[PDB]
Design a protein around this ligand. Structure first.
Ligand SMILES: CN[C@@H]1[C@@H](O)[C@@H](O[C@@H]2[C@@H](O)[C@H](O[C@H]3O[C@H](CN)CC[C@H]3N)[C@@H](N)C[C@H]2N)OC[C@]1(C)O
Ligand SMILES: CN[C@@H]1[C@@H](O)[C@@H](O[C@@H]2[C@@H](O)[C@H](O[C@H]3O[C@H](CN)CC[C@H]3N)[C@@H](N)C[C@H]2N)OC[C@]1(C)O
Ligand SMILES: [Mg+2]
Ligand SMILES: [Mg+2]
Ligand SMILES: [Mg+2]
Ligand SMILES: [Mg+2]
Ligand SMILES: [Mg+2]
Ligand SMILES: [Mg+2]
Ligand SMILES: [Mg+2]
Ligand SMILES: [Mg+2]
Ligand SMILES: [Mg+2]
Ligand SMILES: [Mg+2]
Ligand SMILES: [Mg+2]
Ligand SMILES: [Mg+2]
Ligand SMILES: [Mg+2]
Ligand SMILES: [Mg+2]
Ligand SMILES: [Mg+2]
Ligand SMILES: [Mg+2]
Ligand SMILES: [Mg+2]
Ligand SMILES: [Mg+2]
Ligand SMILES: [Mg+2]
Ligand SMILES: [Mg+2]
Ligand SMILES: [Mg+2]
Ligand SMILES: [Mg+2]
Ligand SMILES: [Mg+2]
Ligand SMILES: [Mg+2]
Ligand SMILES: [Mg+2]
Ligand SMILES: [Mg+2]
Ligand SMILES: [Mg+2]
Ligand SMILES: [Mg+2]
Ligand SMILES: [Mg+2]
Ligand SMILES: [Mg+2]
Ligand SMILES: [Mg+2]
Ligand SMILES: [Mg+2]
Ligand SMILES: [Mg+2]
Ligand SMILES: [Mg+2]
Ligand SMILES: [Mg+2]
Ligand SMILES: [Mg+2]
Ligand SMILES: [Mg+2]
Ligand SMILES: [Mg+2]
Ligand SMILES: [Mg+2]
Ligand SMILES: [Mg+2]
Ligand SMILES: [Mg+2]
Ligand SMILES: [Mg+2]
Ligand SMILES: [Mg+2]
Ligand SMILES: [Mg+2]
Ligand SMILES: [Mg+2]
Ligand SMILES: [Mg+2]
Ligand SMILES: [Mg+2]
Ligand SMILES: [Mg+2]
Ligand SMILES: [Mg+2]
Ligand SMILES: [Mg+2]
Ligand SMILES: [Mg+2]
Ligand SMILES: [Mg+2]
Ligand SMILES: [Mg+2]
Ligand SMILES: [Mg+2]
Ligand SMILES: [Mg+2]
Ligand SMILES: [Mg+2]
Ligand SMILES: [Mg+2]
Ligand SMILES: [Mg+2]
Ligand SMILES: [Mg+2]
Ligand SMILES: [Mg+2]
Ligand SMILES: [Mg+2]
Ligand SMILES: [Mg+2]
Ligand SMILES: [Mg+2]
Ligand SMILES: [Mg+2]
Ligand SMILES: [Mg+2]
Ligand SMILES: [Mg+2]
Ligand SMILES: [Mg+2]
Ligand SMILES: [Mg+2]
Ligand SMILES: [Mg+2]
Ligand SMILES: [Mg+2]
Ligand SMILES: [Mg+2]
Ligand SMILES: [Mg+2]
Ligand SMILES: [Mg+2]
Ligand SMILES: [Mg+2]
Ligand SMILES: [Mg+2]
Ligand SMILES: [Mg+2]
Ligand SMILES: [Mg+2]
Ligand SMILES: [Mg+2]
Ligand SMILES: [Mg+2]
Ligand SMILES: [Mg+2]
Ligand SMILES: [Mg+2]
Ligand SMILES: [Mg+2]
Ligand SMILES: [Mg+2]
Ligand SMILES: [Mg+2]
Ligand SMILES: [Mg+2]
Ligand SMILES: [Mg+2]
Ligand SMILES: [Mg+2]
Ligand SMILES: [Mg+2]
Ligand SMILES: [Mg+2]
Ligand SMILES: [Mg+2]
Ligand SMILES: [Mg+2]
Ligand SMILES: [Mg+2]
Ligand SMILES: [Mg+2]
Ligand SMILES: [Mg+2]
Ligand SMILES: [Mg+2]
Ligand SMILES: [Mg+2]
Ligand SMILES: [Mg+2]
Ligand SMILES: [Mg+2]
Ligand SMILES: [Mg+2]
Ligand SMILES: [Mg+2]
Ligand SMILES: [Mg+2]
Ligand SMILES: [Mg+2]
Lengths: 51, 56, 148, 156, 53, 185
RNA sequence: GAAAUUGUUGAAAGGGAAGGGCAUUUGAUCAGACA
RNA sequence: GGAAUACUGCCAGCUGGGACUGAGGACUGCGACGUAAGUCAAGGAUGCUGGCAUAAUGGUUAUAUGCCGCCCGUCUUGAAACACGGACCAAGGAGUCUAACGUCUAUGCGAGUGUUUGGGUGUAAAACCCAUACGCGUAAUGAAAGUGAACGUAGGUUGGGGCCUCGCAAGAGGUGCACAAUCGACCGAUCCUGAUGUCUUCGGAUGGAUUUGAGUAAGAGCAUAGCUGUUGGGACCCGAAAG
RNA sequence: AAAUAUGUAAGAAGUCCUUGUUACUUAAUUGAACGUGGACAUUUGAAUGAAGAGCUUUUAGUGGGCCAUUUUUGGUAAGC
RNA sequence: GCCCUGAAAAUGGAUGGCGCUCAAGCGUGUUACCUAUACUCUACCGUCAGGGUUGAUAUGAUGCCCUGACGAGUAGGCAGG
RNA sequence: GUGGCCUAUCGAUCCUUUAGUCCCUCGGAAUUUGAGGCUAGAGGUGCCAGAAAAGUUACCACAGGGAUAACUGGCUUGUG
C-alpha cells in the first residue's frame, strides 16, 4: 500500500536483485580495467591535426 | 517529444523507481520479482533485472 | 405521474430543454400533413412511400362480410375437436367411424393447406377449400363436404 | 418516531493497532559535542548562559553545570538542539558524573543531596578552569549577538 | 512470398527447425571498420560567395 | 490533461441484475450468481445473464421447438433449459418425453410436456440436479419474429414494413409504390 | 403580524460608489473537548 | 620521455543540513542480519519529555491589511458595453390534460388475450362475480375477379454460445438454439408453357422466367402500467395589424 | 514532372494434390463456378497500439457561425 | 550595422508606469533565479472498470471487501437526490 | 448495332388522352351501350422536387430586424 523505492531502501534493493549483495562486496562499480598500451597509426593523428 | 539513447544506468533507475506493470490494465507497482514472473515469466524474465535485460 | 416527468428536472433551466436558438414556437412545420409534397417531402418518401395518388377500383356501398371467410389450415384443424374426444380419434383411424369436423360451426370460411395433418381420416365439412388443403385431407383418407 | 432508525450500526468494538515496526535506536550526537565542551545555551531559563557539558543522558538531554559558583547554572538537563557547541574545552577526565541518570531528576526547597553533588562537581571543574586564564571570567559572562554578528559566518 | 514460404518451410523443416518466415523491417546498421588504407580523409571547407552572372 | 483514447466514465451497457422486481426472480439470480462465481462451468455463466434480459430478449420457446431440438443426434436424453416461459404448440402430434427447466410454462405447455410422460422443472430444481449444468440444451426463442422489428430500417428499396395503422389499397400503395404512379419504392 | 421600507438605541467602519474571493492580525461571539 | 588536471560518464560509495507527509489498524507477504537465539529500516509512526485542561485550540462574524474580483438576464461570431428588461418587497406566475400512435421497460396470460356496453352482487361510484358477442392477434397477395404456404429430418453451405465425446493437458471430434452471410424450396401478383376432358370454349394439368409482394418456412401476441417522442386540440406562458 | 495527399495487397475465407456436379462453355470433361477427399498450423507469415470487438432501436439540440497559420479567388485596399 | 535627416493634426498621455545612457537601449553567448487549475508524489470526494465475498454462530447481499484509471463544458441527454 | 464518338440538351401526384390483353368491375341476376380498373406512352409545371394571381398608399397599420439601408464612430485610402 505504500511504494518503497529501491535505490534508497537497502531492504527493498535486496528484495529484488540479490546480486546487489555481491555487487557491493567486490565493489564492481569502481572496477579497474587492465591498462593496455595500444597506439594509433600516425595517419589517424595526422588527419586529426589536419586543416 | 525529446528522445535519445538511454544508457543502462538510466534504464535501471527508470524501471527500479518508476517501473510499473500492466496487469488487466491496472498499472501495478512492480516492487516484487514475483509480479514480473507471474506475467513476463512465460517469456523467460522472472526478475526485474531480467526485464531490464530484455529492454536494453 | 408528474413527479417522474422531466419537465420537473427542467425547473430552473431557462429554455425548458427546447434550446436557446431554436426556441419552441407554434408551428415551424405548418399543421399536421402540411407540406406533404413540398417541404416535408423527404420524409413522406421513404417512411410512407405511396402515400400520394390513386391506385385502384372504387367500390360504392361496400359492406364487409360479403367477404367474411375466416381461414383455418390443416396446420391445426384438429384443434376444432375438443381435446378429450380428440385422442380417441387419433388412434382408431378408420373409415365408417370418422370424426366430423364442421368448420363453419367453428367460425371458419375456407380451409387452407399450411400442411401436415396426421394420417387419420377426417370428414371435414367446409364452405371452401384450398386445392392443396383438400388434397392433404384425401391423401390421409378423409373427405370434404361442401356446405352453405 | 421523529427519525427512522438506521438498518446498520457500526460495531462499537475498538480494533487492535497493527504491529508497528519502529525500533528506537540510540541517538548519535553531532561530533561537536565533546564532554568538557563549553556550550552556549540558546533558549529557556539560562539562555545566554555559558555552560560546561558533562554527560549525554538517557533521554538524549545533556548534563551541564555552570558551574554554580561561577555563572549560577546548577547541574541541569538541557536539550542538544537548543545549544551552540563552542570550541573551548576543559578536561573532565577525573569528574565523576557516574551518579547522574534520568531518574536523578525525577521531580517528586533543594534536596541537600543536590547541594553537595553540585559542590563536588563544580569544585572539580573550577580547579580545571583556573588552569586557563580568563576562562572563568568567560563562563560568567552571558552570550549575546552584537550588531554585525553573522551567526552563519561566525566561528564559535 | 507465400510460395517462397512453403518452399522455405518444407526445405527448412525436413532439414530441421529454425524457420524464420515473418518479415522484419529494416534494422539498424551493424558495426564496421572503414579502412583508411589508400583512402585518406578528404578535408572540405565551406566555400565563399560568388556571382558569375 | 491526457489525450483520451476512449470515452471516459462509460458504463458497459450490459445488465448487472435484472430490471424485474419479482422477488423470486432475484433469488433465482442469487442462486446462479453464486453458482457462476463458484462453478467454473460455463452453463451457469450463460444462465446468470439470460435471467436479466428484458421480456423482448426472452422470446417464447414453443413446445414444438423443444420437440425438434431433441431430434438432434444425441440430444434426445438431454434436459432442455429455457430461461423464460415455454408455450404450447398444438401443431405437433407425437411429442417426446423429456425434462424442461424453465422460468414459466403456459398451461398447455406443461400439460403437453406432462401428458407425454415428461417433467417440468423450475430452474432451481435443475440447479440441484445439474449444478455444473451437465447434459443441458439451452434453447433460445425467435428474437426477430417480433412485430416491431418488421418496421426497423424502413427506406427506399429496403423492403421493410411501413408503419401504417389501417392497411388497404389507397393506404400507402400509390405514388412511389408502383412504376405507373411516380416511381417504385 | 414576514419583506421592502422607517424611528430610537447599541456596535463597527468610512480620502471620487457599495458590495465579492483567498489569507491573517485585531475585537466580538460559540461550542466541543479534558478528565 | 612520464606524470597530473580539466572535461564528460558510471558506482546496488559514505555522509551533513532544511521542508512537506504518517494514509492503514491483530495476523498472514517478499526479504534482510546473525553459527545461533533472535533481531530489523522488510505489505503506510513510533518512542521519550513538557504544557493548556484555564479559556490553550477551533468555528462564526465585524474590521483592517496584501493580492485578486466590471451586472445580471438575454439574443448574438462576439456584451461590463454608448444592445434590451430590470427602483424596491411580498404573493401569484409558464411543456399541462386529452384522443390516437413509435421505441424501450415492467407485469398477467399466451396461440391466444381484453371482468367493468351490459348482467350478477354489494358493507353501494369501491370490492367480488359473469353469458353472449366484439376488438386486436393467429395469412398472405392482387386495382380486381380471385388464389392461398413442407421435394426434403421445414433444405444446403460458412460462422455460432451452450451442451456432448476423447485427451493429464495442449488439443481433436460431436450436436449446434438465438443471431449473421449465401444458394435454394413454398404462397399471391406478373410473363411464358397449354396434358388429360370438353354443353368448342370452357377447363388449366405440366415445366419454365435478370420479374414482383408490408408473405410461408414447428406461431408471438393481447391487455394494464411508466419515461420519452408524434399528431390533433387554447396545447409551455403573454403579444398583432385584421376578419 | 515532384513534395503533401490518395487506391489495393501483407494468408485458414490460405496454399497445393486427387476428382463429383452442371441444363452454362469448348472441336474436345475442354472450361468456368460450386464441392467431396487429402498434405501443411513452434514466426500462420510486417511495425506500433488497443479501457476489447461486433450489432440494433430510439430520441435531443443543431441546421446565422467566427478566428489563427499554410494553399487561395475577387478587390488599390479593408477590422472587406 | 547602430545613429541623424526623410517624418505634418486636432482634450493632456503613454516602451504598461516611474525611470534608464560602459543601460534598465540594440546584437549575442553563459548561468542562477521567479511562478500556472500543467508535470511527479500523498491524502480525501465522486465516476467508471476489473477482482474477492453464502452462512453459521448476525444486525444494511442494493450489502461488505481489495484494486486500477479517470474528472473542462453552452445547447442538449440521462442519472441520483 | 437497345439512337447521334464521349462529356449538356429535361419533367410528380390529380386530370385527360392514346396504345396493350380481350383481362378485371358496376356488388339482387343477365345481355347490350355507357362507366370504372390494370400496364405503357402523350398533353406541364423553365421559380425546372412541379401554387391558379395586378397596382397604389405622403392617409396609413402590425410582428420583427442593427441578420439590412439612410449620420457619427471604426478598418480602407482607389479617389481627393
Ligand atoms: C459597512 N460600512 C462600510 C465601511 O466598512 C467602509 O467600507 C470600506 C470602503 O470604504 C473601502 O473603500 C475605499 O477605501 C479603501 C481605503 N481608503 C481603498 C479602496 C476604496 N474603494 C473598501 N476598500 C473597504 C470597505 N470595507 O466604508 C464604507 C461603509 C459603507 O461605510
Ligand atoms: C485540480 N485540483 C488542484 C489540486 O491539484 C491542487 O493543485 C496544487 C496547487 O494548488 C499547488 O500550488 C499552490 O502552492 C504553490 C506553493 N507550493 C504556489 C501556488 C499555489 N496555487 C501546486 N504546488 C501543486 C498542485 N497540485 O490545488 C488546486 C486544485 C485546483 O485544487
Ligand atoms: Mg541522496
Ligand atoms: Mg401520463
Ligand atoms: Mg424528483
Ligand atoms: Mg436537467
Ligand atoms: Mg443545462
Ligand atoms: Mg431566471
Ligand atoms: Mg428537449
Ligand atoms: Mg429563449
Ligand atoms: Mg436559426
Ligand atoms: Mg426549432
Ligand atoms: Mg414547391
Ligand atoms: Mg376485397
Ligand atoms: Mg381478399
Ligand atoms: Mg353447419
Ligand atoms: Mg363461434
Ligand atoms: Mg506490519
Ligand atoms: Mg523473410
Ligand atoms: Mg484531469
Ligand atoms: Mg444493469
Ligand atoms: Mg390484417
Ligand atoms: Mg395584530
Ligand atoms: Mg424588517
Ligand atoms: Mg444607527
Ligand atoms: Mg465621498
Ligand atoms: Mg467629497
Ligand atoms: Mg471636489
Ligand atoms: Mg469598486
Ligand atoms: Mg606519451
Ligand atoms: Mg567526474
Ligand atoms: Mg537527507
Ligand atoms: Mg516530521
Ligand atoms: Mg497513523
Ligand atoms: Mg526515546
Ligand atoms: Mg505523553
Ligand atoms: Mg503530561
Ligand atoms: Mg474571515
Ligand atoms: Mg458588529
Ligand atoms: Mg466583510
Ligand atoms: Mg483589481
Ligand atoms: Mg434579448
Ligand atoms: Mg440584439
Ligand atoms: Mg449583432
Ligand atoms: Mg460577421
Ligand atoms: Mg450581459
Ligand atoms: Mg461601448
Ligand atoms: Mg454608461
Ligand atoms: Mg429586442
Ligand atoms: Mg439595460
Ligand atoms: Mg429600465
Ligand atoms: Mg417590472
Ligand atoms: Mg426505458
Ligand atoms: Mg357494468
Ligand atoms: Mg346470455
Ligand atoms: Mg376473440
Ligand atoms: Mg363476378
Ligand atoms: Mg468443435
Ligand atoms: Mg413465386
Ligand atoms: Mg418459380
Ligand atoms: Mg432470379
Ligand atoms: Mg422515470
Ligand atoms: Mg399535445
Ligand atoms: Mg379576411
Ligand atoms: Mg501507398
Ligand atoms: Mg500487424
Ligand atoms: Mg468501443
Ligand atoms: Mg437524433
Ligand atoms: Mg428536431
Ligand atoms: Mg432537423
Ligand atoms: Mg454572422
Ligand atoms: Mg491586422
Ligand atoms: Mg517590463
Ligand atoms: Mg556591454
Ligand atoms: Mg528590464
Ligand atoms: Mg520594464
Ligand atoms: Mg543584451
Ligand atoms: Mg543550483
Ligand atoms: Mg464489482
Ligand atoms: Mg477506488
Ligand atoms: Mg462534466
Ligand atoms: Mg445515466
Ligand atoms: Mg445524493
Ligand atoms: Mg444483341
Ligand atoms: Mg445507348
Ligand atoms: Mg456517326
Ligand atoms: Mg467510336
Ligand atoms: Mg409525363
Ligand atoms: Mg380540371
Ligand atoms: Mg384516367
Ligand atoms: Mg394471357
Ligand atoms: Mg361480383
Ligand atoms: Mg346495383
Ligand atoms: Mg354476381
Ligand atoms: Mg374499357
Ligand atoms: Mg395537365
Ligand atoms: Mg420552386
Ligand atoms: Mg427547386
Ligand atoms: Mg405567383
Ligand atoms: Mg393591396
Ligand atoms: Mg401626397
Ligand atoms: Mg389626402
Ligand atoms: Mg491616398
Ligand atoms: Mg492621389
Amino acid at each position: 500500500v505504500l511504494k518503497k523505492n529501491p535505490l534508497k531502501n537497502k531492504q527493498v534493493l535486496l528484495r529484488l536483485n540479490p546480486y546487489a549483495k555481491v555487487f557491493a562486496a567486490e565493489k564492481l562499480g569502481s572496477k579497474k580495467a587492465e591498462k593496455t598500451g595500444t597506439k594509433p597509426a600516425a595517419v589517424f593523428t595526422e588527419t586529426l591535426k589536419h586543416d | 517529444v525529446a528522445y535519445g539513447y538511454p544508457s543502462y544506468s538510466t534504464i535501471r533507475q527508470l524501471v527500479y523507481k518508476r517501473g510499473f506493470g500492466k496487469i488487466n490494465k491496472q498499472r501495478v507497482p512492480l516492487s516484487d520479482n514475483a509480479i514480473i514472473e507471474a506475467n513476463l515469466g512465460k517469456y523467460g524474465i522472472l526478475s526485474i533485472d531480467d526485464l531490464i535485460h530484455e529492454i536494453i | 405521474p408528474s413527479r417522474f416527468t422531466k419537465t420537473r428536472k427542467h425547473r430552473g433551466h431557462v429554455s425548458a430543454g427546447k434550446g436557446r436558438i431554436g426556441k419552441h414556437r407554434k408551428h415551424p412545420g405548418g399543421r399536421g400533413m402540411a407540406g406533404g409534397q413540398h417541404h416535408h417531402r423527404i420524409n413522406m418518401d421513404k417512411y410512407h412511400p405511396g402515400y400520394f395518388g390513386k391506385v385502384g377500383m372504387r367500390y360504392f356501398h361496400k359492406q364487409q362480410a360479403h367477404f367474411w371467410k375466416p381461414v383455418l389450415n390443416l396446420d391445426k384443424l384438429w384443434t376444432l375437436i375438443p381435446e378429450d374426444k380428440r385422442d380417441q380419434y387419433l388412434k382408431s383411424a378408420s373409415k365408417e367411424t370418422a370424426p366430423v369436423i364442421d368448420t363453419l360451426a367453428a367460425g371458419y370460411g375456407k380451409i387452407l393447406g399450411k400442411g401436415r395433418i396426421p394420417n387419420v381420416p377426417v370428414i371435414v365439412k367446409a364452405r371452401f377449400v384450398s386445392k392443396l388443403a383438400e388434397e392433404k385431407i384425401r391423401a390421409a383418407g378423409g373427405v370434404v363436404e361442401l356446405i352453405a | 418516531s421523529a427519525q427512522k432508525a438506521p438498518k446498520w450500526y457500526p460495531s462499537e468494538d475498538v480494533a487492535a493497532l497493527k504491529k508497528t515496526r519502529k525500533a528506537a535506536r540510540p541517538q548519535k550526537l553531532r561530533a561537536s559535542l565533546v564532554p568538557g565542551t563549553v556550550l552556549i545555551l540558546l533558549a529557556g531559563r539560562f539562555r545566554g548562559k555559558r555552560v560546561v557539558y558533562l554527560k549525554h543522558l538517557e533521554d538524549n538531554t545533556l548534563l551541564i553545570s555552570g558551574p554554580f559558583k561561577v555563572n549560577g547554572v546548577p547541574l541541569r538537563r538541557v536539550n542538544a538542539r537548543y545549544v551552540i557547541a563552542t570550541s573551548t574545552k576543559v578536561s573532565v577526565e577525573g569528574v565523576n558524573v557516574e551518579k547522574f541518570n534520568v531518574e536523578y531528576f525525577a521531580k517528586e526547597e533543594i534536596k541537600a543531596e543536590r547541594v553537595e553533588d553540585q559542590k563536588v562537581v563544580d569544585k572539580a571543574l573550577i580547579a580545571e578552569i583556573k588552569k586557563t586564564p580568563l576562562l572563568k571570567q568567560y563562563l560568567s559572562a552571558s552570550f549575546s549577538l552584537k550588531n554585525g554578528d553573522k551567526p552563519h559566518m561566525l566561528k564559535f | 512470398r507465400v510460395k517462397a514460404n512453403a518452399a522455405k518451410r518444407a526445405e527448412a523443416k525436413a532439414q530441421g527447425v529454425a524457420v524464420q518466415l515473418k518479415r522484419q523491417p529494416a534494422q539498424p546498421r551493424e558495426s564496421r571498420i572503414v579502412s583508411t588504407e589508400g583512402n585518406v580523409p578528404q578535408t572540405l571547407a565551406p566555400v565563399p560567395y560568388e556571382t558569375f552572372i | 490533461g491526457i489525450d483520451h483514447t476512449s470515452k471516459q466514465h462509460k458504463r458497459s451497457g450490459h445488465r448487472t441484475a435484472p430490471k424485474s422486481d419479482n422477488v423470486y426472480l432475484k433469488l433465482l439470480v442469487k442462486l446462479y450468481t453464486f453458482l457462476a462465481r463458484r462453478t467454473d462451468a460455463p452453463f451457469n455463466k450463460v444462465v446468470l445473464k439470460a435471467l436479466f434480459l428484458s421480456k423482448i430478449n426472452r422470446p417464447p420457446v414453443s413446445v414444438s421447438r423443444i420437440a425438434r431440438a431433441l431430434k438432434q443426434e444425441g440430444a434426445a436424453n438431454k434436459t432442455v433449459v429455457v430461461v423464460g416461459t415455454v408455450t404450447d404448440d398444438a401443431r405437433i402430434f407425437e411429442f417426446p418425453k423429456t425434462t424442461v427447466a424453465a422460468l414459466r410454462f403456459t398451461a398447455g405447455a406443461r400439460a403437453k410436456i406432462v401428458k407425454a410422460g415428461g417433467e417440468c422443472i423450475t430452474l432451481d430444481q435443475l440447479a440441484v440436479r445439474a449444478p455444473k449444468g451437465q447434459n443441458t440444451l439451452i434453447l433460445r426463442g425467435p428474437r426477430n419474429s417480433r412485430e416491431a422489428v418488421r418496421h426497423f430500417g424502413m427506406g427506399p428499396h429496403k423492403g421493410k414494413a411501413p408503419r401504417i395503422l389501417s392497411t388497404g389499397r389507397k393506404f400507402e400503395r400509390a405514388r412511389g409504390r408502383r412504376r405507373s404512379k411516380g416511381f417504385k419504392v
